[PDB]
Design a protein around this nucleic acid. Structure first.
Ligand SMILES: [Mn+2]
Ligand SMILES: [Mn+2]
Ligand SMILES: [Mn+2]
Ligand SMILES: [Mn+2]
Ligand SMILES: [Mn+2]
Ligand SMILES: [Mn+2]
Ligand code: NA
Length: 325
DNA sequence: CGGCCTACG
DNA sequence: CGTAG
DNA sequence: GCCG
């Protein structure tokens, strides 16, 4: 088992969901307490189990696995021996964990904001609504549309949204293209949002595109919220006789950057953090959604595809459906 | 000891 | 701070 | 929390 998640395939369907879900509760709780390092270890340990070929049934099977030390192994041990881990159950049932989960799932609210509200005694969404002066415009939109945004986005919804985004993009710039990214590109059947990457084959033609696309969507009545090259939107998606709010991210990249943006926006989140860590720490190159930089030569790698980027980093290529770390 | 991804809005 | 994967 |  390689130590970095970008070095091994991770499929969408795997064999250790119970164990990985418990470790991911501890990771989320670590984040709520402000320990990104513990969050990362528990995330990495959960991800190792997703890459295993068979169910773990005995603690022996953890020996030598990266990111399993005393704490993560004890969690697995108790799950194998008893079906539950006391620590995980204590976190699950705690008022702090439940409220921090409730608040941070709001669009516009992160850990630091949620923690302040918790310390002020707030506990419910109705508590937040009663104090609207305490909210940014982004948070007001997240709270207003919270019920809809908690409804899984389906492929039906993705296909309808891709059509209206393609229509607006084509009206804004002939020849521009729209690519579905995010979890749906990795094969997920459901999601929390839909992510799209927009470019044009002639470098430079995409300048100014996103405001033009947004104007065109807003005048078709499709936009409930928006705030450039990244737009974090809430769309008014038509449904039979009605509509529902859906989170949509629109991203524009010049075609020279498109492979890097496609790679970054396809995820998973852990996969991409691990890939950037690998790039810098193992290969001495700096990776983001715009490019891959050699800081000694002061040059950017020219990539024509995601495959080119994996090759330049000395990694076996993984298709999107194996990036579900 | 001390890092842990690296951007944009 | 929030957002993104 | 784990590891370079
Ligand atoms: Mn026991
Ligand atoms: Mn997404
Ligand atoms: Mn840019
Ligand atoms: Mn998104
Ligand atoms: Mn230390
Ligand atoms: Mn994400
Ligand atoms: Na949030």
């Amino acid at each position: 088992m390689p130590a970095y998640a970008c070095q091994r395939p991770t499929p969408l369907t795997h064999h250790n969901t119970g164990l990985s879900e418990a470790l991911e509760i501890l990771a989320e709780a670590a984040g709520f307490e402000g320990s990104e390092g513990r969050l990362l270890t528990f995330c990495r340990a959960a991800s190792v189990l997703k890459a295993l070929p068979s169910p773990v049934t005995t603690l022996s099977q953890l020996q030598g696995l990266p990111h399993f030390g005393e704490h993560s192994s004890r969690v697995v041990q108790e799950l194998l021996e008893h079906g539950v881990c006391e620590e995980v159950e204590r976190v699950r049932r705690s008022e702090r964990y439940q409220t921090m989960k409730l608040f941070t799932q709001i669009f516009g609210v992160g850990v630091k904001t949620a923690d302040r509200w918790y310390r002020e005694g707030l506990r419910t969404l109705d508590d937040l609504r009663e104090q609207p002066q305490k909210l940014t415009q982004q948070q007001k939109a997240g709270l207003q549309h919270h019920q809809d945004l908690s409804t899984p986005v389906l492929r039906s919804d993705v296909d309808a949204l891709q059509q209206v985004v393609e229509e607006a993009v084509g009206q804004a710039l002939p020849g521009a293209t729209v690519t579905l990214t995010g979890g749906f590109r990795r094969g997920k059947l459901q999601g929390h949002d839909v992510d799209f990457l927009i470019t044009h084959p002639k470098e430079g033609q995409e300048a100014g595109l996103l405001p033009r696309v947004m104007c065109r969507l807003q005048d078709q009545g499709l936009i409930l919220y928006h705030q450039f090259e990244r737009s974090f939107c809430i769309f008014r998606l038509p449904q039979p006789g009605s509509w529902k709010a859906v989170r949509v991210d629109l991203v524009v990249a010049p075609v020279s950057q498109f492979p890097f943006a496609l790679l970054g926006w396809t995820g998973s989140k852990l996969f991409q953090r691990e890939l950037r860590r690998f790039s810098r720490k193992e290969k001495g190159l700096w990776l983001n959604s715009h490019g891959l930089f050699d800081p000694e030569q002061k040059t950017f790698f020219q990539a024509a595809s995601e495959e080119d980027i994996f090759r330049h980093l000395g990694l076996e290529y993984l298709p999107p459906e194996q990036r579900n770390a």
